[model samples]
Target: TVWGALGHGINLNIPNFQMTDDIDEVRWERGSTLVAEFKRKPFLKSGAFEILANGDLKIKNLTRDDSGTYNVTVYSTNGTRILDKALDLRILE
Candidate 1:
């Protein structure tokens, strides 16, 4: 249910995050990181959608090399924020 608005500036990057383990369910890859401190409106704006408790960054559309660890950065009133590297994304060819 983690959702973020589609806009400019705000982006996600996976330094090591790779393709997700499940692609059949159309599940977004699970190894990337999201930097959201720059968003005009915090995820708090999106009432329904939310960043998962521990896992937040995800990948959409099936790609072969979207696997690894992504560094998530956030800029808000609290300043920049980082997170764990559990977002280990992997996809079997």
Candidate 2:
């Protein structure tokens, strides 16, 4: 689980996971909604969301709405799923 205060920032990390040379894609979602993605290049729908080079997610300017179950999925260059995990995030006042 992850916790953060409103207006602050939170970094969602995948447990026991790291970016490797064979990594071809990284994806992050908030409650089934695509938040950010990386495929050779990073793709973001909001400036507040960032996909770090190391495959971690950085969320800035947190809000109560940000509290939810976040998911990350990684894929290898050959299109094989490498890592898949979920995290619970709670934004407090």
Candidate 3:
């Protein structure tokens, strides 16, 4: 386990902004990376993100209407990195 050193980084729950289950999708969005504190250890250019194993993980079948901001809080051996840009996601129909 990570020991929850993130304080609140472990459970970053994204509220239902303006997404939809259209096209047989329970959820959809265009995944984008927001570098919070780059040029450091682990050198993360792509923000960390993951979906629970509830089955289904892809964007090829998403739609343009599936657009919103997905957030993720990361913790390293140093500290937490957060990007104000946010993970802007938009599914292309």
Scored by CA lDDT, what does every candidate get? Answer: 0.48, 0.88, 0.43
Query: lDDT tens string, model 1, 1-93?
Result: 344677745445435655554422222344685323222323532343345656464344446555665556545576755433445567876
The TM-score that candidate 1 achieves is 0.29
lDDT at 75, model 2: 100
Model 3 accuracy (lDDT, Cα): 0.43
Please give, for residues 1-93, the per-residue lDDT of candidate 2 as tens digits.
988889988889988998997887888999999999878757787998998889999998888877899999999999998999999998655
Using lDDT as the measure, the top candidate is 2
Which segments of model 1 are wrong by more than 4 Å? 1-55, 80-86
Ranked candidates (TM-score, high to low): 2, 1, 3
> Native-vs-model 2 lDDT?
0.88
Ranking by lDDT: 2, 1, 3
lDDT for each residue of candidate 3 in 6-62, tens digit (9 for 90 to 100) = 546664344664444432322323366442321212322333332335422234444
Model 1 lDDT on a 0 to 1 scale: 0.48
lDDT of 1 at 15: 55
